[PDB]
Amino acid sequence: GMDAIKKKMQMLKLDNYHLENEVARLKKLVGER
Amino acid sequence: GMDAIKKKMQMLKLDNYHLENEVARLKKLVGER
Amino acid sequence: GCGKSIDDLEDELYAQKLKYKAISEELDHALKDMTSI
Amino acid sequence: GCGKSIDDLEDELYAQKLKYKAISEELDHALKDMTSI
Numbered sequence: 852g853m854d855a856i857k858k859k860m861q862m863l864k865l866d867n868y869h870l871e872n873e874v875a876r877l878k879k880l881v882g883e884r
Numbered sequence: 885g886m887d888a889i890k891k892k893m894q895m896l897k898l899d900n901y902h903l904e905n906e907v908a909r910l911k912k913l914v915g916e917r
Numbered sequence: 918g919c920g921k922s923i924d925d926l927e928d929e930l931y932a933q934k935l936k937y938k939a940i941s942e943e944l945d946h947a948l949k950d951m952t953s954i
Numbered sequence: 955g956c957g958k959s960i961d962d963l964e965d966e967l968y969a970q971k972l973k974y975k976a977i978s979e980e981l982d983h984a985l986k987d988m989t990s991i
Contacts, residue, residue: 853947855985856889860954863991867900874907881914885984888948893991896954918960926960930967933974940977 918926 853944853981853985855982856886856991857947859985859989859991860951863896863954867903870903870907874903874910877907877910877914881910884914884917885987886944886948886981888944889954889991890984890987892948892954893988896991918964919956923955923960926967927955927963930963930970933967933970937970937974937977940981944981
């Protein structure tokens with residue numbers, strides 16, 4: 852496979868997934884306070 | 885180059901941007917509270 | 918090309934032509950698989 | 955092998971390897987461009 856974007860996309864969404872997970876739980880906390 | 889990843893990553897980045905922009909302002913706002 | 922290191926040549930020639938077709942097939946499906954990137 | 959057939963092989967070998975260089979260089983630069991998606 853195209854190792855570059857293949858692995859980079861994994862790295863991409865791994866980062867963005869922890870980000871969306873954070874922001875989701877964070878915006879929930881925004882509803883808390 | 886490679887149209888697929890380049891052009892679609894542009895779409896991707898705009899999605900990533902609204903995510904990281906939201907979470908940045910969000911955590912700054914929740915932090916000021 | 919002659920009876921010296923022609924094996925390397927023939928080997929590589931067939932190898933690289935396969936890689937060429939396989940990499941074309943690769944980039945096509947590689948990006949197509951990730952319709953969700 | 956050598957005498958006539960190999961010439962077409964070397965002809966093609968040279969061409970295929972140039973295309974291989976081109977395609978790999980192209981796609982390398984394609985990901986090299988951003989390198990941080």
